[PDB]
Structure formats: structure tokens, C-alpha cells
Design brief:
The complex is a heterotrimer of chains A (275), B (10) and C (100).
Chain A lengths: L2 E10 L8 E8 L2 E7 L8 E2 L9 H28 L9 E10 L5 E10 L2 E6 L6 E3 L2 H12 L2 H23 L1 H4 L6 E8 L4 E11 L5 E6 L2 E2 L5 E2 L3 E2 L5 E10 L6 E6 L7 E4 L2
Antiparallel strand pairs in A: 1-2, 1-5, 2-3, 3-4, 5-6, 6-7, 7-8, 9-10, 10-15, 11-12, 11-16, 13-15, 14-15, 16-17
Chain B lengths: L10
Chain C lengths: L6 E6 L9 E10 L5 E6 L2 E2 L4 E2 L3 E2 L5 E9 L7 E6 L7 E4 L5
Antiparallel strand pairs in C: 1-2, 2-7, 3-4, 3-8, 5-7, 6-7, 8-9
Classes of the chains: A alpha+beta (275), B little secondary structure (10), C mainly beta (100).
GO molecular function, one term (chain C): MHC class II protein complex binding
Subcellular location (chain C): Secreted; Cell surface
Keywords (chain C): Amyloid, Amyloidosis, Disease variant, Disulfide bond, Glycation, Glycoprotein, Immunity, Immunoglobulin domain, MHC I, Pyrrolidone carboxylic acid, Secreted, Signal
Chain lengths: 275, 10, 100
């Protein structure tokens, strides 16, 4: 159905310990495909997915070029902001930039993004209309005014609606077997004795892609949201994800509970039951 | 593919 | 400055069955700032060949990283994840429980 491409950049100053560390990563949906690490020995944008390895030196040199440029920009950005906020040269600080685009089920442009955060707090963001800016603090105002004057938005709009969506489609095609796949979750349930009248029923979802999933428990078909421990979807490390939901069941009441699993790769949602 | 629009906060 | 505590989950890639090769994972998420120390322990000792994913973050800007190492579980061996971050008084140690 729908798809997205995202680039995440993190610059952290090492006052007195060299130039700031810069990490850049690229994603298509839930699959990372590239990365750059300033502390790394190669100093090149590197492939992280199989489908991007055979792009060619023009692609790699071009991206390496541009990512290095992102590095140099963020380096100056750190200084700008320590200044904007009156901070000392001693402290370590963080700049985070994220830009990308969403395409719908029909593969046409849907949403564009471009925003920054300073020390984990929103700094500036390109609005949905891709014409205006949401400026956080007093400091961000300088930036907003500057960017409005220079007509940065229109330049960003062109990329998000053009190049971003165009290359996303290309990547989708290039890596059709991975990106255009869906792995349904492998489900199972575990029972663990707690006391003499209580047991934990845990519902598992393993080896699924993409990461979106709805795992819930019910008692007599009634919601049990507030009574369910539900962990954060986690990466198995091989490209798939995992997730579990559990309920503490009064002994003899197992039959009353049903686990429900919803996922893109399932032909129909699952209703699991301990019996 | 990465953005190519040169951008500095300040 | 904003400081968020890392959530921690220690688990294997595939269900753990003794004597078979697997990957022990320790996933840290929702933290800020980015410096964090994550160690995988075999019976208390530190494991040496441990790698991690490339630093990335969520919509809310908090970070996440996956630390991992190849391992072959046994009935005997105990595994754990020790994590340290500004938001933690002492290192936080979470044990690997097959059933989680």
C-alpha cells in the first residue's frame, strides 16, 4: 500500500574531543538502506540493504558528497545554536534533522517533512502545506525569518514532491522483493504459573514485516486494554520485528480470553485462544 | 536520495 | 536539558532452543541524550564481540539502538544486558528470560 522514505541525522558535539560526531541513516518504510558515520574509517555513504549495493559509483560518490556536506552544515549549526542559547563551550549538545516523504497506496506524493530538534526539543519544522514554518522558541525565530526571506520552503517543496518521491518509487522497484513484501507474524501463547490462582498468558507476534501491528487481549470479548502489559515492537535484527501482550488470568478463566492479531501480512486478523 | 538544497540554521 | 530514560529489552532473534546458534539482542529505546553504554553479559562476564545498529531516532526525537551478538544458548548459561546512561543512578541490569 503506502510507503515512506526518511533520512535521520544526529550531530553531537565532543567539546575538547575532536569535531562533533555525525551519524546519518536512510530508511524506506522500516528498512534502513544507507548510513554515514563520521567516526568511521571509510568516510563514504555505505549500503545497508542488498538492493542498494548495485547502484553504481555515481550514486555512491554523489551521496557521499552530499552527506559530507550535511556533516559540515550540522557542525556549523551546533556552534550557531550554542550561541543562540548562550551556552558554554564545555557542554556536549545535539542537533537532529529529519526529512523525507510519504506516498499513498497509489504511489503519489502524500506528505513531506523537514525538521530539526536541539537537545531533544523541537527547533523548527516545515509545515504540512510545505509553504510555512512552525518556529519553536525565540531563537528559532531568527532561523524562521531567515528561511522565509531566502525562500527555503519552495526549494524544499520541489525536492519532497519531486526527487524524494521519485527515488522512493525507484527504490521500491529496485528492492521489490523485500520492500514490497509483507511477512505475517508467527503467533503463539505461553502460560506461566504466578500464584495458586493466577497465571500469565502471553501472546506472541514474531518474524513480521512491516513493523505496524495491533496485538490486544479480550475477556468475554470485552476490551482489556488497561489490564494488558504490551511491550514496544522490537527488531529481531534480521529485518523482522517482534511484540508481545500479556494478561494475568485468574486460574480457571483461560477460556474467557482471546488474543487478537492484526497485521498487513495476514489474510484475516487472528483470534488466538488458550485451549 | 539526499536533499541537495544548501541549508544552515544561522 | 531534556534527558529521557532508555527502555530495555533483552531477547533472542529466534526462539531459544539449547545447543542451536542464535543472536542475543538488547534493544534500547526512548532515550536522550545519545551516549549510552550497553554491555551483554555471559554469566556476569562481559561479552566482547557485540555490535549495534547505526544510531537512529523516533518521531519524538528519542534514540534507539540494537546491540547484538551471536550465541548458542544452554540450560546452564545466564545472559544479561547492563546499561548505563545519565538518567541512571547505577548501571541497569536486565536478565534474559527465554519467555520474554
Amino acid at each position: 500500500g503506502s510507503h515512506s522514505m526518511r533520512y535521520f541525522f544526529t550531530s553531537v558535539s565532543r567539546p575538547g574531543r575532536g569535531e562533533p560526531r555525525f551519524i546519518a541513516v536512510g530508511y524506506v518504510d522500516d528498512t534502513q538502506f544507507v548510513r554515514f558515520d563520521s567516526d568511521a574509517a571509510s568516510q563514504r555513504m555505505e549500503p545497508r540493504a542488498p538492493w542498494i549495493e548495485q547502484e553504481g559509483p555515481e550514486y555512491w560518490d554523489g551521496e557521499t558528497r552530499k552527506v559530507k556536506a550535511h556533516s559540515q552544515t550540522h557542525r556549523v549549526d551546533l556552534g550557531t545554536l550554542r550561541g543562540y542559547y548562550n551556552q558554554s563551550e564545555a557542554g556536549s549538545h545535539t542537533v537532529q534533522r529529519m526529512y523525507g516523504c510519504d506516498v499513498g497506496s497509489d504511489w503519489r506524493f502524500l506528505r513531506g517533512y523537514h525538521q530539526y530538534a536541539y537537545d531533544g526539543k523541537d527547533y523548527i519544522a516545515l509545515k504540512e502545506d510545505l509553504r510555512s514554518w512552525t518556529a519553536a522558541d525565540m531563537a528559532a525565530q531568527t532561523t524562521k525569518h531567515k528561511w522565509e526571506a531566502a525562500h527555503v520552503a519552495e526549494q524544499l517543496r520541489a525536492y519532497l514532491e519531486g526527487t524524494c518521491v521519485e527515488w522512493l518509487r525507484r527504490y521500491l522497484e529496485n528492492g521489490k522483493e523485500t520492500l514490497q513484501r509483507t511477512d505475517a507474524p508467527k503467533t503463539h501463547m505461553t502460560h506461566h504459573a504466578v500464584s495458586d490462582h493466577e497465571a500469565t498468558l502471553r501472546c506472541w507476534a514474531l518474524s513480521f514485516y512491516p513493523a505496524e501491528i495491533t496485538l490486544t487481549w479480550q475477556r468475554d470479548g470485552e476490551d482489556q486494554t488497561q489490564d494488558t502489559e504490551l511491550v514496544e515492537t522490537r527488531p529481531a535484527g534480521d529485518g523482522t520485528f517482534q511484540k508481545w501482550a500479556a494478561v494475568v488470568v485468574p486460574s480457571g478463566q483461560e477460556q474467557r480470553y482471546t488474543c487478537h492479531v492484526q497485521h498487513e501480512g495476514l489474510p484475516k486478523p487472528l483470534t488466538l485462544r488458550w485451549e | 536520495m539526499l536533499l541537495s538544497v544548501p541549508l544552515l540554521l544561522g | 536539558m531534556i534527558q529521557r530514560t532508555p527502555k530495555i529489552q533483552v531477547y533472542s532473534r529466534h526462539p531459544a532452543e539449547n545447543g542451536k546458534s542464535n543472536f542475543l539482542n538488547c534493544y534500547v529505546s526512548g532515550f536522550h541524550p545519545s551516549d549510552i553504554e550497553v554491555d551483554l553479559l555471559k554469566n556476569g562476564e562481559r561479552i566482547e564481540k557485540v555490535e549495534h545498529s547505526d544510531l537512529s531516532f523516533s518521531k519524538d526525537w528519542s534514540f534507539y539502538l540494537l546491540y547484538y551478538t551471536e550465541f548458542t544458548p544452554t540450560e546452564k548459561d545466564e545472559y544479561a544486558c547492563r546499561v548505563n546512561h545519565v538518567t541512571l543512578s547505577q548501571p541497569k541490569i536486565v536478565k534474559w528470560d527465554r519467555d520474554m
